[PDB]
Amino acid sequence: AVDYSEPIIIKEKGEIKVVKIGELIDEIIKNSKNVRKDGILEIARCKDVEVIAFDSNYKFKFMPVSEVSRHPVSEMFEIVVEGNKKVRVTGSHSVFTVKDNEVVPIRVDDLRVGDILVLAKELEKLINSDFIFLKIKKINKVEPTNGYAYDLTVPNAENFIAGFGGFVLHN
């Protein structure tokens, strides 16, 4: 449920890089051994690869990705926030918002302009977090670059960030 072209920061066998998520995943699937093609999602196990996710103190750290997935898709939403930062994602998938001073998932097709979204930096808990909270400018649905949406499974966290602005995504 993220577009081919959205970038992510990973660590692969110990080295950091910025990759397009679809290139990373196509490649991984392409050179694995036992891809699971069962449905309209293809799934593959991956190794030596980590992503940035927030922990229970709301702080970022690199964490292993167990497996990756993709699926053909006809639609995609673009979300723009304060600062003209954006990401393209599936309307079914989830990001985070604030409510009662804790961050909480919220599904994308339930979003509305002027709600507060959580992204990466740069209620004592909120203050100490690596988050910023920005309001939605507009949300303009669109078509998917390489008609394929992508995802990651991140054990012990169930989140990760992606997009130039480091939008936080929920599994």
Task: Report the C-alpha gap between 163 and 102 in whole angstroms.
Answer: 22
Rounded Cα distance, 170 and 105, in Å? 7
- Which technique was the structure solved with, according to the deposited record? X-ray
**Domain 1-171: assigned CATH number:** 2.170.16.10
Max distance between CA atoms of the chain, in angstroms, equals: 47
CA distances to 51, 67, 97, 135, 136 from 114, rounded to whole Å, are: 29, 34, 11, 5, 5
Q: Residue 120 forms beta bridges with which residues? A: 131
Burial 74-107 (b: 16+ CB within 10 A, else e): eebbebbbeeebbbbbbeebbbbbbeeeebebbe
Tokens representing residue 164 in the block: 């130039």
Question: 151: number of CA atoms within 13 Å, CB side?
Answer: 21
CA–CA gap between residue 138 and residue 72 (Å, rounded): 25
- Separation CA 24–CA 34 (nearest Å): 17
Q: How many CB atoms lie within 10 A of CB 168?
A: 26
Residues 6+ apart with CB under 8 A from 109: 77, 91, 92
* Contact (CB, 8 A) for 106 and 139: no
Q: How far is CA 98 from CA 51, 87, 139, in A?
A: 23, 19, 18
Q: Please name which of 109, 93, 88, 85 lies closest in space to residue 3, comparing C-alpha atoms.
A: 88
Chain centroid to CA 64: 14
